[PDB]
């Protein structure tokens, strides 16, 4: 009889979330031609893992990914958000 914590669309759209990723994700992530491919992959995963941890500590990384997948498939508000993003970028 205890409400479970879920990665709801509400969460995703908060200030700590997708807007956080858009605001500061190119600065922290950097794919280098002088670096090994494994290093670049680990850097990208590092950034997204820290963001995920901040957002939703309950889950692991892979679990997080899976959850993200399901949420994105299901939620209609999230869909709207995404579309909005894409639209606004296409207008630039």
């Amino acid at each position: 009889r205890r409400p479970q914590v879920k990665l709801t669309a509400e969460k995703l759209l908060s200030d700590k979330g997708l807007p956080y990723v858009l605001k500061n994700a190119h600065k922290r992530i950097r794919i280098s031609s002088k670096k090994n491919s494994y290093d670049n992959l680990s850097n990208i995963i590092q950034f997204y893992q820290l963001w995920a941890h901040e957002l939703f500590p309950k889950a692991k990384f892979k679990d997080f990914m899976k959850i993200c997948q399901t949420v994105g498939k299901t939620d209609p508000v999230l869909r709207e958000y995404r579309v909005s993003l894409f639209r606004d970028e296409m207008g630039m």
Binding site: L22, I29, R79, R82, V83, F86
Partner: peptide
């Protein structure tokens, strides 16, 4: 830049 967000989610069908 939108693709950073995009990565996380399945393709849009719009």
């Amino acid at each position: 830049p939108a693709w950073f967000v995009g990565l996380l989610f399945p393709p849009l069908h719009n």
